[PDB]
């Protein structure tokens, strides 16, 4: 009875899920930083255990999404599902995960099989960010910061273009360079470094 | 109280910085050495965060991440500011109390110096 009480408790389940999640993340980090070495098949834990993880995660997500309440029209459930921005981040997550798996299947494109996983890895970080809203204090701050950051991100573009034009004018004034590499360098890195 | 709070936030922020660093480390170079790997994963990126970007060991979507981190730091600052305001009321009475405690102790203290 005491065991059922301790384990079945929802909060405990969430705590354990967080622990296993952080462990997932760090273990996948190490597996990528190690199994990167052999282009061929690779260590077992690197690919097989990873596929087991991602398959289980997708299974839990899809079940929670589809079979929670009732067997209503799939179109209505889908329209609800796609509306959520966290659902959007998870969708681009699955996209990046499958793209990374497909590129890891590719031994000739080693640069691709590396960069796709590199860009992908930030996904689990992002999800862990959203998975910490439980506690009282910082929750509301994070929630409001989401919308505020959206509104501000709409703003940044203009000032960035302004800085770009400033850099372009100064560069075209300083050293009046057909090499595209050095041109793009003096056009982008010099002003950002300034 | 503000610092008693911010201890939690400093964890998620640090982890995010570490994630950016690990991404950049697996991005730049091809190492078994545990000390060298941990160094190139943790010390070099935090060094790039404070203006130490060793392009000789990095150069044979970073701009978006950099500006997003700058904005996130600004939002942390705004959090601190928003939290700062409310406290002043209860702070008045609490500090008043602390003052009495300090004064009664000081009168209790003897005349001689600590040496």
């Amino acid at each position: 009875t005491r065991w059922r009480k301790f384990w079945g408790a929802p909060v405990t389940v969430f705590l354990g899920n967080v622990v296993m999640y952080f462990a997932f993340l760090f273990l996948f980090s190490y597996v990528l930083l190690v199994d990167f070495r052999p282009p061929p098949q690779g260590p077992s834990g690197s690919e097989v255990t990873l596929y087991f993880w991602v398959f289980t995660l997708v299974l839990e997500e899809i079940r929670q999404g589809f079979f929670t309440n009732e067997d209503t029209r799939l179109v209505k459930k889908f329209t609800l599902y796609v509306e959520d921005n966290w659902n959007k981040c998870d969708m681009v997550a699955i996209f990046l995960f499958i793209v990374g798996v497909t590129c890891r299947m590719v031994p000739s494109v080693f640069e691709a099989g590396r960069t796709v996983l590199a860009i992908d890895f930030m996904v689990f970080t992002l999800r862990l960010i959203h998975i910490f809203a439980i506690h009282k204090q910082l929750g509301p701050k994070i929630i409001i910061v989401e919308r505020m950051m959206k509104d501000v991100f709409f703003f940044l573009f203009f000032l960035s273009v302004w800085l770009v034009a400033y850099g372009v004018t100064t560069q075209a004034l300083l050293h009046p360079d057909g090499r595209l590499e050095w041109i793009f360098r003096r056009v982008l890195y010099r002003p950002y470094l300034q | 109280r503000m610092m008693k709070d911010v201890f939690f936030f400093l964890f998620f922020l640090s982890v995010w910085l570490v994630a950016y660093g690990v991404t950049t480390q697996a991005l730049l170079h091809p190492d078994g050495r545990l000390e060298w790997i941990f160094r190139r994963v943790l010390y070099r990126p935090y060094l790039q965060i404070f203006g130490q970007i060793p392009l000789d060991e990095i150069d044979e979507l970073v701009t978006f991440l950099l500006v997003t981190n700058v904005l996130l730091m600004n939002l942390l600052i705004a959090m601190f500011s928003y939290t700062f305001q409310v406290v002043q009321g209860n702070a008045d009475m609490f500090w008043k109390f602390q003052r009495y405690h300090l004064i009664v102790e000081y009168h209790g203290r003897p005349a001689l110096a600590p040496p």
Binding site: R2, K5, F6, A9, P10, V11, L15 | -
Partner: protein, 295 residues
């Protein structure tokens, strides 16, 4: 005022009649000087009977003048006894075509007619709105009167009669949130701009949260139990489900339901559990036996 006063004085002097004073009340309807009608007609000796008053009550329901309806049900009117399915039929028929409700019923009925003021059509539309109750299905006397009438009032976008009907509704809050969701949908579908804003200006959820706060201040556990139930009037569905459908965040913002969630959050020894105590309990699996924290 004095006109009707003299009219009823003369009517009374000539005779004391249920039907004469009936006609006099029918006059007083449009004038709506109820503060005088109650005094002259009812404070007097003459006694009323359910039938005459019930016909004029049907009239007054069409009038959308609630105060008289209140006085009438105070006159011993048994709307429960009055209610028949056909009454509801004729009433739902009795609406302005200006009402977007009327156009909606017309278009639903037109779609039904092409496929192959109708109770079936109304049930169809309501089910399409909530899909939480498929209740629907003249001489047959229909149970759950006040629910049905309240629903009719909210549909007609008449707020006062709605409040009165809620005042004697059996279920506590469920109907209120149902109404909030429905009127939100209608406002989203409202045609005329000012009419749309006025629709949007309902604020039933305020009433819901208030009643909930009241019951919570008293029971504080039975109130919890209340939130979790099944209501036969509503296809035996949980209120929380309704809150989800309406997406009325305000109601959730009430601390009471928050403490309830905090309770469910653990399942055992919820309120008393330091975070470090929980972490240590996770550390050694014998803490539950150790009796370090209550259970």
């Amino acid at each position: 005022t004095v006109i009707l006063k003299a009219l009823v004085k003369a009517c009374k002097s000539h005779s004391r009649d249920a039907q004469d004073y009936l006609d006099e009340l029918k006059l007083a309807v449009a004038w709506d000087r109820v503060d005088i009608a109650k005094s002259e007609i009812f404070n007097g000796d003459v006694e009323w009977k359910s039938c005459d008053l019930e016909e004029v009550m049907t009239d007054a329901l069409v009038s959308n003048k609630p105060d008289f309806v209140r006085l009438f049900v105070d006159s011993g009117a048994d709307m429960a006894e009055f209610l028949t399915y056909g009454r509801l039929q004729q009433l739902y028929h009795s609406v302005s075509p200006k009402s977007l409700l009327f156009e909606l019923l017309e278009r639903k009925h037109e779609e039904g007619r092409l496929t192959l003021f109708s109770l079936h059509e109304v049930s169809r539309v309501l089910k399409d709105f909530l899909h939480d109750a498929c209740r629907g299905f003249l001489s047959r006397k229909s149970e759950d009167p006040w629910r049905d009438l309240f629903l009719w009032a909210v549909l007609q976008n008449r707020y006062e009669m709605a409040t009165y009907f809620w005042a004697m509704g059996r279920e506590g809050v469920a109907a209120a949130l149902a109404a909030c969701k429905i009127i939100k949908e209608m406002s989203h579908l409202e045609k005329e701009a000012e009419v749309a804003r006025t629709m949007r200006e309902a604020k039933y959820e305020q009433l819901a949260l208030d009643l909930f706060s009241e019951c919570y201040s008293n029971s504080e556990d039975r109130a919890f139990a209340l939130l979790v139930r099944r209501n036969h009037s509503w296809s035996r569905t949980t209120c929380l489900h309704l809150a989800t459908e309406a997406d009325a965040k305000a109601f959730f913002a009430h601390d009471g339901v928050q403490a309830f969630l905090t309770k469910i959050w653990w399942g055992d020894m919820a309120t008393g559990t330091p975070i470090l105590r929980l972490l240590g309990a996770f550390t050694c699996p014998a803490l539950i036996y150790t009796n370090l924290i209550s259970f």
